[PDB]
Design a protein around this ligand. Structure first.
Ligand SMILES: C[S@@+](CC[C@H](N)C(=O)[O-])C[C@H]1O[C@@H](n2cnc3c(N)ncnc32)[C@H](O)[C@@H]1O
Ligand SMILES: CN[C@@H]1[C@H](O)[C@H](NC)[C@@H](O)[C@H](O[C@@H]2O[C@H](C)C[C@H](O)[C@H]2O)[C@H]1O
Ligand code: SF4
Ligand code: SF4
Ligand SMILES: [Cl-]
Ligand code: NA
Length: 300
């Protein structure tokens, strides 16, 4: 992340969650979407908030995602609301693909890039993926299809009191330091989806996630506040209940809603060998994607 020409520049993306809910129930969903009921972003509200933020912030892309963004009633309108702010160079939609065959030609015209996460329990036939590749080529859309074999544990209601562990997890966290998973929610900016979406779903009520957020504002001192927030190198309140990027690997599966919540003590869920690996190289592959199909667009 850089400070240049009056704005904080993110070489990665700003994340806009169209829908907090999902039609799947993946174990260890990083946004805890299986625990959320229907909540669809207001395109006008998103446009206003990102318009304010764009005066001081620019990213390479805007990632429209959430739980499952294709559940949104007006995803093209949300896409265009994001594009109109100029906050990013391109607009990307990330989807589990289970609803992509319902999308109309305005969806394919509206997106710049499309990322489909394909999971074992909701497999898309290779011929349907080929159809998606053809549609993407036809509309000049960069396409990435990731076939997930595993997920890593992401959080627990039983957090840790060990400050060294929190520091190790935050220090190796790809979301905070590498992917720059900056997340806009309800007028606040967050370093990561976990810090805003996980506390609200802890069964004891959690805490106010705004302690880890930055209120999005226009005032002449917003830029510097933003730069300090996005460059700060101290763990968040949420890291004490988060596994970051070093959670234990497990086969990807869906679980029933009943008992979905995680209670095992956080220290038991750290993949300590992988934590060493990531301590040496923060970009180390997480082992979650088993196969990937990429169809880029020339000149992109
Ligand atoms: C919340 S999902 C994005 C929305 C969309 N429904 C999807 O899954 O593609 C965020 C991204 O992180 C991945 N993800 C979610 N939970 C994960 C976990 N526990 N470990 C590794 N990747 C995870 C998903 O595969 C997806 O690429
Ligand atoms: C291997 N799979 C990764 C990978 O493809 C990344 N490519 C840079 C991508 O950034 C990741 O996505 C982010 O994963 C976080 C857990 C949450 C965040 O909301 C989401 O954007 C995705 O999981
Ligand atoms: S498809 Fe799975 S990982 Fe993606 S939002 Fe839904 S439950 Fe979470
Ligand atoms: S809560 Fe902490 S460890 Fe978890 S994703 Fe955010 S910065 Fe990373
Ligand atoms: Cl045709
Ligand atoms: Na559509």
């Amino acid at each position: 992340v850089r400070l240049a020409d009056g704005k904080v520049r993110n070489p990665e993306g700003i994340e806009v969650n169209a829908s907090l809910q999902c039609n799947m129930r993946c174990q260890s969903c990083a946004h805890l979407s299986p625990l959320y009921r229907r909540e669809n972003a207001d395109p006008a509200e998103i446009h206003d908030t990102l318009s304010v933020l764009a005066r001081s912030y620019h990213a390479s892309y805007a990632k429209i995602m959430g739980g499952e963004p294709l559940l949104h009633p007006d995803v093209v309108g949300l896409i265009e609301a994001v594009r109109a702010t100029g906050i990013s160079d391109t607009v990307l939609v990330a989807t589990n693909g289970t609803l992509l065959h319902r999308a109309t030609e305005r969806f394919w015209q509206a997106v710049d890039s499309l990322e489909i996460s394909v999971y074992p329990s909701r497999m898309i036939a290779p011929e349907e993926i080929e159809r998606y590749r053809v549609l993407a080529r036809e509309h000049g859309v960069s396409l990435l299809v990731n076939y997930y074999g595993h997920f890593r544990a992401v959080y627990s209601e039983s957090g840790t009191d060990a400050p060294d562990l929190v520091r190790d997890v935050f220090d190796t966290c790809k979301l905070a330091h590498f992917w720059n998973s900056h997340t806009v929610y309800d007028g606040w900016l967050y370093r990561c989806p976990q810090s805003v979406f996980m506390p609200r779903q802890l069964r004891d009520g959690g805490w106010d996630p705004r302690v880890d957020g930055l209120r999005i504002e226009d005032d002449p001192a917003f830029l510097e506040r933003l730069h300090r927030f996005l460059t700060a190198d101290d763990p968040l309140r949420a890291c004490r209940n988060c596994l970051g990027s070093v959670g234990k690997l497990h086969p990807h599966q869906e679980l029933p809603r009943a008992g979905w919540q995680v209670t095992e003590q956080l220290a038991a869920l750290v993949d300590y060998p992988f934590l060493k690996v990531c301590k040496d190289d923060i970009t180390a592959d997480d082992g979650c994607v088993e196969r990937s199909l990429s169809a880029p667009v020339g000149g992109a």
